[PDB]
């Protein structure tokens, strides 16, 4: 607390807000998440903590877990600025299609290292993927859900942003699969290359909808067990699936089938990070590197 020096504040997430603070006594510059409540379930603390074994290349590094007072502190290693931020100032020229295609494949491959582990984010998000100057790019604030879970809000007074949550999380599928991180991320690919969300919901039915009138309203035939589904309806419209051309041009074919892998409806029919990795949209990766202004 006093042993830090609040720098900014980088952003509120869902569980809580992100601050750049500098180390009183290292001079160590760090990112922290703070979360604020009877005090805390105990039992987040054991496997919020097992995260710090969490070791790989394209996963931000969590250095410490600290309760105190009512609190919950997450100190996360610091990167140069996270993926929303970096396509916002790139709205205007957009980002190289070779450094898309770097960082899809670098988010795959934390991705597969993760889900081996049997480790889920569920949360994905531009603000949860964050990017240095020699073109890395890194998933970090893992957990969370599987410890936590959430209410119509994320902590305080902050609503749930809907629109890379996969469709058997809105239907409410009380079990979740790694299969959920392949929809955010193919969520996320989307936007990276057309500059806007796919599917910006205002509101669950909304987010629900927006997706069905892309991809067709899904029924028994396309995804097996939808119609017995906690939140299914049979008063859902029913919209037939479009021309996928709209969704991600101008994107090359094979883009566009590696997305629409990602996209599937059916959680057994949607591709793995380790399958991803193998498709010939990746032939050709290099690793450029970012123009940046920090
Ligand atoms: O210029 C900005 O706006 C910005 C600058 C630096 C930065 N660095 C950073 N490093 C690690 C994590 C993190 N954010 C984060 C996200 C989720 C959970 C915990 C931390 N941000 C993020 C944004």
Same mark, same amino acid.
């Given at each position: ?5 609040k720098? &900014? ?18 001079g ?7 979360? +604020?409540?009877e ?29 105190? &007072? ?7 290693? @610091?990167?140069? $600025? ?6 916002? =100032?790139?709205?205007?020229?957009g ?9 899809? @494949? ?7 290292? !993760? ?5 889920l ?5 531009? $603000? ?11 998933? =970090? ?5 599987? =410890?936590?879970?959430?209410? /119509? ?6 609503? /749930?942003?809907?629109?890379? +949550? ?6 409410? !599928? ?9 929809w955010?991320?193919? !969520? ?17 039915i909304? $987010? ?11 029924? &028994? ?19 037939? +699936? ?18 629409? $892998? ?9 591709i ?23």
């Open positions: 607390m006093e042993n830090f020096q720098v &900014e504040k980088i952003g509120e997430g869902t569980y809580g807000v992100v601050y750049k603070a500098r180390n009183k006594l290292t160590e510059v760090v990112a922290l998440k703070k979360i +604020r409540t005090g805390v379930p105990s039992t987040a603390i054991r496997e919020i903590s097992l995260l710090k074994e969490l070791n790989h290349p394209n996963i931000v590094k969590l250095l410490d877990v600290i309760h105190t &007072e009512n609190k919950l502190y997450l100190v996360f290693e @610091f990167l140069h $600025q996270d993926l929303k931020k970096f396509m916002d =100032a790139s709205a205007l020229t980002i190289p299609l070779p450094l898309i295609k770097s960082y899809l @494949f670098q988010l795959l491959q934390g991705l597969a290292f !993760c889900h081996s582990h049997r480790v984010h569920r949360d994905l998000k531009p $603000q949860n993927l964050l990017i240095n100057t020699e073109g890395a790019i890194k998933l =970090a604030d893992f957990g969370l859900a599987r =410890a936590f879970g959430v209410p /119509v809000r994320t902590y305080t007074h902050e609503v /749930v942003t809907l629109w890379y +949550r996969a469709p058997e999380i809105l239907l409410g !599928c009380k079990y979740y699969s790694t299969a959920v991180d392949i955010s991320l193919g !969520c996320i690919f989307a936007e990276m290359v057309t500059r806007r969300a796919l599917f910006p919901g205002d509101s669950e909304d $987010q629900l909808f927006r997706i069905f009138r892309t991809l067709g309203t899904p029924d &028994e035939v396309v995804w097996p067990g939808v119609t017995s589904m906690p939140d299914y309806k049979p008063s859902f419209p029913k919209w037939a +699936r479009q021309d996928f051309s709209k969704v991600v041009p101008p994107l090359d074919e094979d883009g566009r089938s590696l997305l629409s $892998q990602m996209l599937h409806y059916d959680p057994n029919k949607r793995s990070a380790k399958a991803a990795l193998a498709h010939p949209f990746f032939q050709d990766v290099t690793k450029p590197v970012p123009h940046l202004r920090l």
